[PDB]
Write a protein that binds this ligand. Structure first.
Ligand SMILES: [Ca+2]
Ligand SMILES: [Ca+2]
Ligand SMILES: [Ca+2]
Ligand SMILES: [Ca+2]
Length: 281
DNA sequence: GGGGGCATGCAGATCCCACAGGCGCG
DNA sequence: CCGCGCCTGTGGGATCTGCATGCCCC
């Protein structure tokens, strides 16, 4: 059960990709709940165990027949999470949800949430957090601003990038029809972090940003399709900065196809065998 | 007696992932 | 011609996010 721990910057990078900070204010006088959660497919339960071993907090639960959840609600345990992200701060817009989550923690640590003044402040905090206030709290506390300080941060290091890639990244092989094999690396992200995704082009020395129609599409792609860039830049980066989860296994199969491509790929039966065991198994 | 915290289960919403096709260029 | 890589496009599920209840304890 007790599995390996992970580098704390890799964990923050995975949290930037897959984490969620929650502030629930329900009328059971109001009940206050703070939470951190990650939901993944069972294939990546090892990641949740890795985080649980590194933080030494959190409950791992099956969220159905297909999914697994790591959830932290115990108040003292949320202090462990604050201390981690204070030393290893998030990079995406989720940092703002973390900061509001931390602000809510100080209201509750000072027991102010038991009185009416604390609830009003917690409602103001929740308004700027994630998807904002629900209809009931919008009516019961109409005083309601969703605006919050802007975030525009740079990639802190490659260890963060490995955890981020383990979450939102993708390694795959294309078989285009004469059949040619092409390696592709892609990270997708909501356009709310376009600057950070643009940051990747010079940070990795390769790649392009693709957006489609910016007026009707809320997410973009950072992609590297040039084999020399995959072979000389992306592979050495993630070989030195270990990925986690099945993304690591997909990367290792990905690199097997890369060695074949640098050795005159065209023969192809072994590449098709590796591809069958990638994002299908 | 019960307020408040914790665990728990489930549902809503969407941002991802893992791709494919057309075609200009060296 | 051939192999490549820019560029455009996306289904649908793995995510992110949120709601509700029960039971314990000081
Ligand atoms: Ca993400
Ligand atoms: Ca993310
Ligand atoms: Ca993921
Ligand atoms: Ca993700």
């Amino acid at each position: 059960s007790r599995r390996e721990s992970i580098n704390p910057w890799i964990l923050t990078g995975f949290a930037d990709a897959e984490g969620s900070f929650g502030l629930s204010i329900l009328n059971r006088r109001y009940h206050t709940r703070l939470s951190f959660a990650i939901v993944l497919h069972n294939k990546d339960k090892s990641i949740l165990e890795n985080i649980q071993s590194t933080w030494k907090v959190g409950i791992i639960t099956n969220d159905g027949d297909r999914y697994v959840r790591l959830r932290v609600t115990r108040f003292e345990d949320l202090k462990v999470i604050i201390d981690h992200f204070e030393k290893y701060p998030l990079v995406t817009q989720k940092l703002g949800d973390y900061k509001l989550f931390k602000q809510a923690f100080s209201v509750m640590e000072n027991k102010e949430h038991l009185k009416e003044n604390g609830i009003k402040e917690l409602v103001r905090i929740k308004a700027k957090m994630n998807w904002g206030l629900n209809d009931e709290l919008k009516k019961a506390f109409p005083e309601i601003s969703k605006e919050r300080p802007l975030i525009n941060k740079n990639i802190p290091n490659f260890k963060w990038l490995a955890g981020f890639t383990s979450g939102d990244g993708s390694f795959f092989v294309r078989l285009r029809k004469r059949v040619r094999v092409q390696l592709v690396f892609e990270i997708s992200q909501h356009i709310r972090d376009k600057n950070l995704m643009n940051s990747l082009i010079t940070y990795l020395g390769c790649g392009h940003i693709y957006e489609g129609n910016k007026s009707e599409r809320s997410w973009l792609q950072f992609r590297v399709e040039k084999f020399s860039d995959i072979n000389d830049k992306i592979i050495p980066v993630f070989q030195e900065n270990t990925l986690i989860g099945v993304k690591l296994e997909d990367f290792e199969d990905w690199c097997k196809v890369a060695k074949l491509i640098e050795e005159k790929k065209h023969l192809l039966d072994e590449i098709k065998k590796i591809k069958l065991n990638m994002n299908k198994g």
